[PDB]
């Protein structure tokens, strides 16, 4: 009943668009040590996506301003220091999520579905760290992202159907990682195309409860392919 109250409070915070409150509720649920249900897993994922998402969006705006103010030394230095402040928040949020994944989520995942979901999530949060990392630190971070995505990729190919939304969502983010982080448009296109074509060949495997999610991800995979081959 206590865990159920924290989950109800998280759902209230979601509706009120108070994502710091939502993330704090779901972090406390996770820290209780019990394996999360599909609903709890999704509430934790939505909460942190919005929390980290606000920083990634702010980072992109401030970086664009920093580039556009070349020539104006005072304006550019200010944009640089504000970008550094946003990066610190971003790193603190990513480290919070990655710590939850290492200590509770990945070790307790008893199903292929949840294990793939958390390893993809580990891949995503190291990728967000990689977007604002530099030097030696970056090489290690990028490596960690690739290793998490690779293990999730192998499990999904072995245990899930090609139309499974989690398998598809992983192929979408792993292809984004190759394009944006590793600067490999051909590997990114090959991954995305294979995932799309294998799902298209087995549309009979779609379920009524998840066909919308599956078809939406397939559309996103093909949108990326169109963009990357233009």
């Amino acid at each position: 009943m206590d865990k159920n109250e924290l989950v109800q409070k998280a759902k209230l915070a979601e509706q009120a668009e108070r994502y710091d409150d939502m993330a704090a509720c779901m972090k406390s649920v996770t820290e209780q040590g019990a394996e999360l249900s599909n609903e709890e897993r999704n509430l934790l994922s939505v909460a942190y996506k919005n929390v980290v998402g606000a920083r990634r969006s702010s980072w992109r705006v401030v970086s664009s301003i920093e580039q556009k103010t070349e020539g104006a030394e005072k304006k550019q230095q200010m944009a640089r220091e504000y970008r550094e402040k946003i990066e610190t928040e971003l790193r603190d949020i990513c480290n919070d999520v990655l710590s939850l994944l290492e200590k509770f989520l990945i070790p307790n995942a008893s199903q292929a579905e949840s294990k793939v979901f958390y390893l993809k999530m580990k891949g995503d949060y190291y990728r967000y760290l990689a977007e604002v990392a530099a030097g030696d630190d970056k090489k290690g971070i990028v490596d960690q992202s690739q290793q998490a995505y690779q293990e999730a990729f192998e499990i999904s190919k072995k245990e899930m159907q090609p139309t499974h939304p989690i398998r598809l969502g992983l192929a979408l983010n792993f292809s984004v990682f190759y394009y944006e982080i590793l600067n490999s448009p051909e590997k990114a296109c090959s991954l995305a195309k294979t995932a799309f074509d294998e799902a298209i060949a087995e549309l009979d495997t779609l379920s009524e409860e998840s066909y919308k999610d599956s078809t939406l991800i397939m559309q996103l995979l093909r949108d990326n392919l169109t963009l990357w081959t233009s």
Binding site: S45, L172, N173, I217
Partner: peptide
Amino acid sequence: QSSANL
């Protein structure tokens, strides 16, 4: 930008 998001 087109990721899952997640």
